[PDB]
Amino acid sequence: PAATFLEHLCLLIDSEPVAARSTSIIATIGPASRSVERLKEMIKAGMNIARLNFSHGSHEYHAESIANVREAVESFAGSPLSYRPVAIALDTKGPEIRTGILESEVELVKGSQLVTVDPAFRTRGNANTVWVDYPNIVRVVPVGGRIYIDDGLISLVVQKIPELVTQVENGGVLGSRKGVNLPGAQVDLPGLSEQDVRDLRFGVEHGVDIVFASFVRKASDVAAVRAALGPEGHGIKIISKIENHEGVKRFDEILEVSDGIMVARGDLGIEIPAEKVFLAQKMMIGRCNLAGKPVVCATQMLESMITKPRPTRAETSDVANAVLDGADCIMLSGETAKGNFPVEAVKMQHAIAREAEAAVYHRQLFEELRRAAPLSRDPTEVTAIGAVEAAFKCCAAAIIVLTTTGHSAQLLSRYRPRAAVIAVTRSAQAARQVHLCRGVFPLLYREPPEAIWADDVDRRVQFGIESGKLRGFLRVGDLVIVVTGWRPGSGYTNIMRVLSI
Amino acid sequence: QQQQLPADTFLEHLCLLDIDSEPVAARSTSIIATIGPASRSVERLKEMIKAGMNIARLNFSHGSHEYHAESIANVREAVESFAGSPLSYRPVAIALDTKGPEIRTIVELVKGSQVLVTANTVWVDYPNIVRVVPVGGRIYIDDGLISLVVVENGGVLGSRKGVNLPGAQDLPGLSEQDVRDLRFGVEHGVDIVFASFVRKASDVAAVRAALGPEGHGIKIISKIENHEGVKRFDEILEVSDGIMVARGDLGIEIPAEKVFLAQKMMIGRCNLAGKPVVCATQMLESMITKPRPTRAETSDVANAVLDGADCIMLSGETAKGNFPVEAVKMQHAIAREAEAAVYHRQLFEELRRAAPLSRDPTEVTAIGAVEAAFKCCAAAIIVLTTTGHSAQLLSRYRPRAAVIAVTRSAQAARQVHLCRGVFPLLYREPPEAIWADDVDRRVQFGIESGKLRGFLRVGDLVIVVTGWRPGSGYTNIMRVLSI
Amino acid sequence: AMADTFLEHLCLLDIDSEPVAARSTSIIATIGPASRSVERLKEMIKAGMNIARLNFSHGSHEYHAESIANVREAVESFAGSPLSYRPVAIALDTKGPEIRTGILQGGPESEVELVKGSQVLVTVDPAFRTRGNANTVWVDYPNIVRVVPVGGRIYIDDGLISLVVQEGLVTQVENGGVLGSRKGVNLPGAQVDLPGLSEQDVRDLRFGVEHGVDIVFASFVRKASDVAAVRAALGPEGHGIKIISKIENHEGVKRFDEILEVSDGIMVARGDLGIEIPAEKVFLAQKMMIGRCNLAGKPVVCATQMLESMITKPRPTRAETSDVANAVLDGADCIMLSGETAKGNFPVEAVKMQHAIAREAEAAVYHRQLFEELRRAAPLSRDPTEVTAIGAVEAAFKCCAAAIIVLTTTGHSAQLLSRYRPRAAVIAVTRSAQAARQVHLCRGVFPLLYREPPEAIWADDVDRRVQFGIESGKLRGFLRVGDLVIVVTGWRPGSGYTNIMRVLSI
Amino acid sequence: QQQLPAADTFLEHLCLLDIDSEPVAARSTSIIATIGPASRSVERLKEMIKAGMNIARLNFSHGSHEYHAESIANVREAVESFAGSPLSYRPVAIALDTKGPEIRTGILQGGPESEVELVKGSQVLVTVDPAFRTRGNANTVWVDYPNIVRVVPVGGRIYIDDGLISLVVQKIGPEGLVTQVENGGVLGSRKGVNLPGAQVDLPGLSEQDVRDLRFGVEHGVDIVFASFVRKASDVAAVRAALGPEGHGIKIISKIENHEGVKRFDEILEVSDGIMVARGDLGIEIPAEKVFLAQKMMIGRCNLAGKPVVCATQMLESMITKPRPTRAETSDVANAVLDGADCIMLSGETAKGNFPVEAVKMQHAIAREAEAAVYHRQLFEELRRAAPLSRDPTEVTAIGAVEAAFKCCAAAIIVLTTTGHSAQLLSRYRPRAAVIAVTRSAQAARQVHLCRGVFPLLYREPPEAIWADDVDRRVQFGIESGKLRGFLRVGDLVIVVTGWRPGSGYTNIMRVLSI
């Protein structure tokens, strides 16, 4: 029915979704969700990627978090057909600026007159004193320069710049060690601080699967993340976070060099006017779709759930619209790191996505994507679009790719099939990183290779099919599109066959 | 370029939204703000008008008759304070929001504990409750944040809060209080009735009947707030002047995951029929407490504009919060950016295509005017309208150029805010002897108000729409004039 | 016409769907022996001729003065009823730089047969200009032996005779056949350097102005400067004359875009064009130019061999029927007749056929796609006239307007409306007799010459003209009671001030 | 090349047709040529093959059984003369064109190759009287359909010779029709007559037609163009007559009159494809309307994915002159641009003085026209319209086409047993050539019925190991491909094949580089 655009819309509430939701969900790990038991709960509810937010907590503290995710995850390895892998994502600290330690709450008051970088004063913070961890602030913020504290809920205007006389423009309840922002001011603060490099090495050492790299402003920024990531970490997927004007202006350059993007609406939402983020968001998602790289929508999607068990009408709506925009993943932060309803937040994102996903007008979408996408000569894309097409023609229940590094699956999702892309792979990491791609569902294949190749292929396909039935992707009578390669290894995907279940 | 000038597809389109492309243009989506303690003061009202309020909502769920007579007295007072300058005067509509069949509750409720409906005792003003909630029947309290199975979800309960009984069905659309309320409305010349809990054609019939003879002029916007309302939408729409997607109630009556569908569907259908549609509730909540909205709220506003909504609302945000003006400014600012992001191309084509042939000279002139507008990047379309009807016809098609509507009907100049992209001008002079001349004076009036407010500058082309003889229903001419 | 796609569209063409509507592609007929008679002309006017073509490749000045005298005479024979009077334009077709064979050996009407596989000499020799035989033809383009290489083709007589170059050029007869006196010679792939404007051409053009022809079809136009000359020659007395450039060879095709910019319109001269370039390729040339012209909003004419067999037979072949329809469906503003009406035994019948095919093809147009497509492609504009025009078209579609009635002084406003291809008829009222003629060059326009002297009060003059259009409208069966009509007019008298659109009921 | 710059719209598209854009690619519209005195000679046939003929039409309106057995003997002989190199052998179909319920005048008075003039305003007599079978003259035409005198009423019109001659019947009578000539002209022997508006009780299948059809089977013709098809049941008969020995024969229904046009949808469903017989059609219905009939049927055929043939007078003047008129050139192109799968030649190759030259021209026009198709719109349009399907073969097919577009595939190489898979591919109108490899000689012939398919007959005996047999065939296709200039080093090709041997198991698409 619902599947013009107007027309489409007009035909969208009792049409029960039916299908693996495909927008994968990223949840940040924190006190509210570090416990193996809680993690297991969140896995059941639909978390696919676990975010470690390195703005907080020590190395040891995160090694615990990983230890636990890994623990919660493997607790299901008891049935290979049902095992959901889970990716792990290191979110980098980058050039944050932050206030000192005071869970007491100093009230900064509208109009009252001091930002200091004096070591001694590094905890002497008061109703009239706030100290900040970026010495250069006193040199980069001119008279009538605006300073923001805590998610931009606090505003100060610089009025006298020896030791920053500011006046509180927007006051509020200030807490411990909070994000500071200096828009219109050029931060010479480096993309890669020593801590960031340590943090990244840690990452590799512990085999995280994805680096969400904060404050990416330019191609060279992701180069560093790569260098730091070092040789041991070429497999790591680097997702550039876009969080400020420059990032937005150099987006095209950033996208080219990165594996994907995150629309970091939090910072972005203070660095540029609030009325504008939507544009930035819808724009980068578009461009990303066009290039066929993962894009992540983030921050405050479900805030009030930090405190309440139900989201607001806007948050529901936000989630839907991100999916309808084309986002590959959606995220949770405060919602799962500190709040009183982490599992319930995950369940909600899972539920909205499934409805939003059923409302996509693939028609327009696939045509649009086909149309825009330039010719290509790489057999893999060729097979991929070929597969998608066959998939539409017959309402394929699913497309089952054999993939070594996920790259073939990615190519399929690029074109947004409606049929599920069931990816079979022996690379445990690949099976994790692929959650970065809308509509892909990884299956980790454990058996050792058969002697005769073909047979190995057949075993894997049949493996996918079997896991398929078990999980209710495919039922007898369905047609399935199978995509595979002429010889073993990666980069040789080149075959599409049409099989009946 | 500006206003998102820099496509052939929607994808393409999206890919070219630019963040430095300064919006430039009267925002079109009109803003509704609910009046309450945070905003009943003449001075505060003046502030909100400057920020962009166009409709004032009186929420009859709360406060007495006298208390609202005060609010109207004030809105009127704030508004007329600008009548010092006819070229600049912004009318403001007044909308009565009906109480309808609510259920309400003068401590923390703990998860797992028993709570009796009549710390563990809550009394309710719907007696039939004990008769319609069976064993396993869910009872929700306060904005659906508190849950009760005949306590599932705990939380802080306050005094007299919304109660909902989903899956359960009897309470009349029109209670005696509602009728009094409506009479009050007519008596005080409200311009619009947002009618709560509309579930079926006959429901709006009553609102009309109650509204009585003295109130045929009153526009009746039906609030959709529950399953039934959603299922009978097509019938309700036919009979109503337009719609409100009441996401609050709706968002408890049906699963939360689903409202977006309801919303995008109704807005589509309304667009199709050319009736105003209003998006409402929680668009900017956190601003009830904080001076800045969350990234989701920003996003919500834009997407309602981009969905097609004619008006967007504010409730807690302007009735009780600490940042009413600041909430209005925000809606105004989002709308303007979302409006420059509309892909009129697809939109107009889509509307044209879908709209059936017609034979009414007015529609004919209208679509023609729009088309001319596009061809030249008209700065604006200037209609002379008696009841607004011709301005409405123009907006139907979603010109990008502004629809400047000149009218002597003060009320029409108000009710027209219900229509995306229209900008009313109330014309005060007495008629000229020679007709034509009267026409010319009005057009020129519109033009002059036009320059003054920065809709049109020298060199612009404007599309003028008028009628062959005086009275309504005779719109039938389109002229192309240069400024 | 209400289908969502072109495929769909096609699939719903109905053979019992009687056309109903003024055909809109105007027809151009060449005047010759078969059609110089006032009586025959009157017949052809009734049948639907709109433009009369005088082919200056043939006959003397006196001979054409007679043709014009006659057309004018046939035409004015109907001035007895202003409401019905069909103007008819007159078009001078230029001789330009031809190349021709001689007078056959002892015979200004006799026939030599050129045999397949035989040797033939082509000479440039003054003496031989009359000495044409079975192994010998002479030609009046001396440079030929210098521009045609070994293994180069020479086509003779409409391209029906063919020579390959293997004091004179040694040629094998590729394609043989019966050759007569003084016939056209073509050298494809070869470059010609003969002037666009020969002395004769200039005299011819002056003649044109002198006699008030309305249109110059200018032959062999290869480049912007070529139309400049035609304009210069046309002289001051002739600014009003519309110059339609004829595209007839490779160069013309390659410089099309420049030619188009400088011309009032185009003719796809498929005859010459169809020898200068390979035959397989003309369709491309034709469909391309018509597209481009549509885009620019200038008249484009499709011409030559549309109905040949009718020169001899009373019924066209299945291909010719097909050719006509496709030309209309391509977007051509006018279609032409030549041999068909100049010499053949069925001139009137040929005109009737073009009139009949066009009407069906016109009802098969998928305006939807067309108007959208035109809208879409047309750039913004700021000229009140275009603005009013597209606005009028749009209103027209919305209500299935029976017609659009423009008041136009130089035809310009009517042209703008047709640019967008309304389905409703464009009824143009004008006092300029010449404009009322030249407008036929614009698909879907129907001119009405208004004769009354101006009223004192302006407005009233306007009202009289509109009402004039209406009345002529009912009388001719364009509009009936109950119809809506879209009226386009101006705020003050003069040209270039069109700026109002009203919607009126009949 | 291939009109690559020629775009977001159709208008745009048109505006970019470039005359120096040399076509480059097998032409895909196959060409049908009627065999006749001008072209029965083995040598002439060989010439026509080289020029591009793909299907040979035997017109059973004329000549005896023996005369056609000769024509077939010859085509076959011309064709097999090239079997000397399997990589370049062009199969050629053979099509029996049925006589059906035609009506005809007699031989002319002692003038077999003579003529009579029928004069405007005079009295002609139509006689069914056998005695005057051959006694025709300026005032007398005898006709071979007896009932004519019981079916053409007073005031009823009779057309003779391609509609160029016209009689109005004014007096009915005990020995024939007393006509007044409404259109006159030079009449020849045994020419077709049409009774429009007058309904012809003449059977679709006359005894002769049945014999004719049996002959067909007996001699293994590949295609029956069935004349005057008016209704589903008409093709049933052709099938019945065709008998068991002839299920393989493709039956193309000729649409030649009003009824045919009105029942088209029913006829299409039951037939393997269609011919728009514009000759008859063009007299039975007004001439101004044929174009509509033609564009409509071709559209519908495209939609259903059945071959559609455009026919009659496409190049007439070439019967007499070595060069076609500007309209005929144009007619050919528009038929291809309309979507026609095959184009035909009749007079042009049966009798005229330039049969080869006529074939060459159609070949040359088609190639240019084929580079002008706006596949974009076309494939979208086809996709869009085509309903979901569940048959692996269609699925593979559309998918192959799509891959083809994505990379500008030089070709699609299918392995097909009965041609079915190749047909499914053309259905979607790829731009890339559909090279079909098959061991069925017949299939290789019948596939010419399908736009853009180029059959290759594979001769080697099967390999022991399947797969290897597959690989040999693909490689066979490739090799024939390079040799004929379809594919060059560096190209991508899309290969379509099956999981097991036999027909109906096509289900794999691979992407290979050359």
Ligand SMILES: O=P(O)(O)OC[C@H]1O[C@](O)(COP(=O)(O)O)[C@@H](O)[C@@H]1O
């Ligand atoms: O990592 P990629 O580039 O997606 O490769 C997918 C690969 O998976 C396969 O289907 C099977 O790979 P393996 O047998 O090496 O595990 C290959 O044919 C193909 O190269």
Ligand SMILES: O=P(O)(O)OC[C@H]1O[C@](O)(COP(=O)(O)O)[C@@H](O)[C@@H]1O
């Ligand atoms: O209110 P509506 O229905 O849009 O009517 C618009 C009317 O405005 C006019 O332009 C002027 O009306 P008035 O002179 O009464 O103000 C009329 O021509 C037309 O009928």
Ligand SMILES: [K+]
């Ligand atoms: K000439």
Ligand SMILES: [Mn+2]
């Ligand atoms: Mn951030």
Ligand SMILES: [Mn+2]
């Ligand atoms: Mn409510």
Ligand SMILES: [Mn+2]
């Ligand atoms: Mn010429």
